[PDB]
């Protein structure tokens, strides 16, 4: 059994390295301990009719630990991630979770106006978001929601979810593995970029096969996403950034 320990956080179990590149550094400010903890996101229930979940990195780790504090205080920071998606399932639970790590995971909005989604709805953080079977158009012209309308089979970006495996992916197949680990290096056009506005990665937990258990009516098991910022180094220390999330 694999037991990976980083900083002051240990996770017991296969792990895959995104694009075969390990997170490594490039005077940046690198907390070797305060930012290497495996911050645990909000656990999400995998309902029988669930369509999927999506988080934005490092947006997900904006309020957890000192990583978010260094991210808001500093101007521009680069950080690799280690995403451990653990789904406790019994021998009689069937299902598969595609854990995709989309670089620059641009999602589609609900309104007819292109790229009209707001910053608050595009950066939900630890909460994340969820996919939808169809594309429900925003009809509130007086007060547009300005939120994503991610579609499962379209991956929220118009591409096919079947081809989404071009990204760094890992399949949590409850019959063979109850957890998955993806080590994402800092992927960006720039050597280092502002994290408060830019989301380096996007994690998508999509049920490739529906969850069933003993022919039960409704079955829901927990899914815990634990993200660890690896080699997170920031630069441009200045006054704290307090974004408007409404």
């Amino acid at each position: 059994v694999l037991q990976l320990t980083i900083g002051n956080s240990t996770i017991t179990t296969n792990s895959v390295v995104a694009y075969g590149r390990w997170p490594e550094f490039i005077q940046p400010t690198e907390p070797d301990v305060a930012t290497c903890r495996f911050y645990t996101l909000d656990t999400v229930m995998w309902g029988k009719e669930s369509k999927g979940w999506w988080w934005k990195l490092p947006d997900a780790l904006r309020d957890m630990g000192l990583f978010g504090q260094n991210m808001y205080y500093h101007y521009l920071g680069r950080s690799g991630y280690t995403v451990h998606v653990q789904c406790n399932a019994s021998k009689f639970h069937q299902g598969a979770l595609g854990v995709f790590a989309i670089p620059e995971y641009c999602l589609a909005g609900d309104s007819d106006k292109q790229r009209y989604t707001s910053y608050a709805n595009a950066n939900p953080g630890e909460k994340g978001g969820k996919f939808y079977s169809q594309f429900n158009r925003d009809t509130a012209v007086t007060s547009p929601k300005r939120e994503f309308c991610p579609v499962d089979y379209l991956l929220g970006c118009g591409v096919l979810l079947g081809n989404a495996f071009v990204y760094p992916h890992q399949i949590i197949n409850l019959r063979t593995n109850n957890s998955a680990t993806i080590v994402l290096p800092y992927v960006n056009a720039m050597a280092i970029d502002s994290m408060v506005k830019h989301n380096n990665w996007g994690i998508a937990i999509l049920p490739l096969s529906p969850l069933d258990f003993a022919q039960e009516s409704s079955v829901e098991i927990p899914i815990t996403v634990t993200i660890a910022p690896m080699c997170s180094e920031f630069n441009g220390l200045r006054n704290v950034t307090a974004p408007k999330f409404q």
Partner: protein, 232 residues
């Protein structure tokens, strides 16, 4: 194994010049089509876009080729001498022309082509002019951040997946010839051939028709066709 991957290379995959824009330029009388400024981008056409959206980041020395095709409009028996078209670059910040007879057409520091109609299409190479270390076909962020201390929401309101408003400036095409009574409507087709292409972080291609300059989509969300499960 023994079969070479020459045609499959990224340099070969983008070795074709793709129409990225069609600019209509007229020499009509001052009655707005005298000149035309097209924001330089491949997202006006879907083919080269989709070829580029195959990857998240790109770094290529572009090659633009302008094919100008002119016609006589509103005249059955029309005459006009061989026209010269000025294709001027206006990078982000350079003053844009407000009229055909504007000073900015002098091109003291803006690079410009003067293509004589009927000659070989005007080709020019452009290096990687990206600010970052690679072109960002996809951006999962914004340009501004709405802060708690902002007076209003429009201060930090920015378009999603939009880095800069003036991405790479505008291409201003005009007919250098004086406005003649005979109206000659011309179409300048810009063909983009990425050279020395280096791509990073591949992405699956868009299976639904594009909708705007982002990853949004409105209709035609049915890429796959009906087919039996056990039908070969």
């Amino acid at each position: 194994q023994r079969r070479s991957r020459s045609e499959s290379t990224i340099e070969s995959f983008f070795a074709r010049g793709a129409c990225v824009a069609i600019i209509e330029v007229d020499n009509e009388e001052p009655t707005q089509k005298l000149f035309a400024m097209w924001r330089i981008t491949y997202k006006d056409t879907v083919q080269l876009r989709r070829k580029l959206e195959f990857f998240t980041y790109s770094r290529f020395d572009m090659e633009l080729t302008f094919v100008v095709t002119a016609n006589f409009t509103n005249t059955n028996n029309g005459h006009a001498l061989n026209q010269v078209y000025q294709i001027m670059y206006i990078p982000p910040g350079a003053p844009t022309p407000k009229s055909w007879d504007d000073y900015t057409w002098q091109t003291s520091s803006n690079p410009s082509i003067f293509y004589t109609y009927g000659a070989a299409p005007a080709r020019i190479s452009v290096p990687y002019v990206g600010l970052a270390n690679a072109y960002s076909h996809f951006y999962d962020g914004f340009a501004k951040v709405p802060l708690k201390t902002d007076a209003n929401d429009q201060i930090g309101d920015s378009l999603y997946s939009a880095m800069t408003v003036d991405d790479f400036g505008v291409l201003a095409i005009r007919v250098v010839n004086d406005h003649n009574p005979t109206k000659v409507t011309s179409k300048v087709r810009i063909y983009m051939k990425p050279k020395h292409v280096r791509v990073w972080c591949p992405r699956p291609p868009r299976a639904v028709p594009y909708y705007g300059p982002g990853v949004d989509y409105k209709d035609n969300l049915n890429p796959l066709s009906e087919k039996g499960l056990t039908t070969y």
